[PDB]
Amino acid sequence: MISLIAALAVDRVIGMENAMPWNLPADLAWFKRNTLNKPVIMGRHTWESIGRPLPGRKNIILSSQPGTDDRVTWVKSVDEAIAACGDVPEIMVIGGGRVYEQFLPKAQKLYLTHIDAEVEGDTHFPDYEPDDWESVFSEFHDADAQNSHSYCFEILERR
Numbered sequence: 001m002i003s004l005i006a007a008l009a010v011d012r013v014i015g016m017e018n019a020m021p022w023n024l025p026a027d028l029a030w031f032k033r034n035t036l037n038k039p040v041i042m043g044r045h046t047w048e049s050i051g052r053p054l055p056g057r058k059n060i061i062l063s064s065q066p067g068t069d070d071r072v073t074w075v076k077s078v079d080e081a082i083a084a085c086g087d088v089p090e091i092m093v094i095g096g097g098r099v100y101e102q103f104l105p106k107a108q109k110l111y112l113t114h115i116d117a118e119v120e121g122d123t124h125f126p127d128y129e130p131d132d133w134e135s136v137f138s139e140f141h142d143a144d145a146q147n148s149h150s151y152c153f154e155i156l157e158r159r
């Protein structure tokens with residue numbers, strides 16, 4: 001089954017850099033744990049944003065362009081991306097914006113990290129009608145020395 005995992009700032013703004021405010025160590029650990037030993041699907045910008053395949057995971061890159069790295073699997077369509085995962089309990093879609101939009105209608109689970117920050121970005125996480133989604137887990141954390149902003153993990157399940 002298909003899950004989306006994403007770090008969202010206020011107004012559901014999403015970005016991707018090794019900088020503020022999506023480089024919080026605790027959001028990274030959450031991300032690792034929830035994607036470990038699962039196939040990950042991602043856009044090209046997100047693939048560059050990591051510069052390296054994620055270990056112990058099958059990495060699948062959805063892009064209209066041909067591939068430039070043989071350590072990972074390149075595909076051109078949503079259904080090709082899904083098939084490339086094989087028979088597995090959970091597929092993890094890890095961004096970016098356009099990829100979320102494409103997989104949301106087929107997703108049955110959302111892993112969201114709400115960061116209590118504001119950053120300027122045109123790229124947003126797709127609007128999920130809260131009538132079709134049920135929150136089933138929440139975990140708020142205060143800012144500390146390692147994590148500059150407060151943050152809250154949430155898991156939602158499609159209703």
Ligand SMILES: Nc1cccc(Cn2ccc3c4c(N)nc(N)nc4ccc32)c1
Nearest residue numbers: 005006007027028031049050094095113
């Ligand atoms: N160095 C590195 C290792 C793993 C991932 C990345 C970039 N990256 C790529 C995706 C993510 C990411 C995500 N999809 N969701 C959440 N909640 N957090 C995330 C944090 C980082 C992400 C960078």
